[PDB]
Amino acid sequence: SSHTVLLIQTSPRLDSRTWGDYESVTDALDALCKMFEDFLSVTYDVSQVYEFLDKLSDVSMMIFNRETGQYIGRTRAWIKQQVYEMMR
Amino acid sequence: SSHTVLLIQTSPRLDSRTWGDYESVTDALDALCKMFEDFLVTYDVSQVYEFLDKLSDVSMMIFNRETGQYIGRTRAWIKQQVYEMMRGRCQHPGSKRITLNERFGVLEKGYTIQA
């Protein structure tokens, strides 16, 4: 398991920058879809999550790497690839 | 200069979590000193430590150019850096942006973004 920070900015305001942290990448991705599901409040296809992540002004993850004891920055594209695999 | 992400939670409410990023560690520390002054002229050492202790959460991700990855630093380390930056101003007893998404994407390709 890798401690994960989820960093988001929802509008162009710098004051919309928020973060959450999680004991697992799984927990962080789970947390991110829940954000999307609440905006949705229904089913949805991958395209809809993709569009949701595109409309964020900034979204990334910083994920603990045991080899280095340091965090790797992951992009929105990386995040969408994992969301896709959560849904295949 | 090491790109730094500053993670803050001002109150015990989870929705007071916010972050900022900076071109150097010094800039991120300076931002904390400015937060401290905004929450207040003159101040003593104890106020700076306890301002930092009263934050529900404060930590940094500091870029390490040799690994391309970020070192995490928590409150105990931040307090010593901030004290050193603030030591000369404390009373004592006696007497246009880059998003993280884009920056991480340039990094995944083998490049750093340099101020």
Numbering used by the authors:
A (entry chain B): 4 to 44, 51 to 97
B (entry chain A): 4 to 43, 51 to 105, 123 to 142
Q: What does the literature reporting this entry say, word for word?
A:
Complemented by biochemical and mutagenesis experiments, our structural biology data support that PICS is an octamer composed of two copies of each subunit, and unveil the assembly interface within PICS complex.
To understand the molecular mechanism how TOST-1 binds to ERH-2, we made a similar fusion protein by linking ERH-2(1–103) with a fragment of TOST-1(34–54) via a (GSS)6 linker, crystallized the fusion protein, and determined its structure at a 2.20 Å resolution. In the TOST-1-bound structure, the ERH-2 homodimer is similar to that in the PICS-1-bound one. However, only one TOST-1 molecule (aa 35–54) is visible in the structure since the crystal packing prevents the access of the second TOST-1 to the symmetrical site. The TOST-1 fragment (TOST-134–54) adopts a helix structure with two extended ends, and the helix is accommodated into the oval-shape pocket of the ERH-2 dimer. The helix of TOST-1 (aa 39-48) interacts with both ERH-2 protomers, ERH-2A and ERH-2B, via hydrophobic and electrostatic interactions. Leu39, Phe43, and Leu46 of TOST-1 make extensive hydrophobic interactions with Val8A, Trp22A, Phe73A, Tyr80A, Leu10B, and Met71B. By using ITC binding assay, we found that D67A of ERH-2, R42C and L39A/F43A of TOST-1, abolished the interaction between TOST-1 and ERH-2, whereas the ERH-2 D67A binds to EBM in a comparable affinity with the wild type (Kds: 4.3 μM vs. 8.5 μM). In addition, those mutants abolishing the ERH-2/TOST-1 interaction, including D67A of ERH-2, L39A/F43A and R42C of TOST-1, all demonstrated delay and nondisjunction in chromosome segregation and cell division.
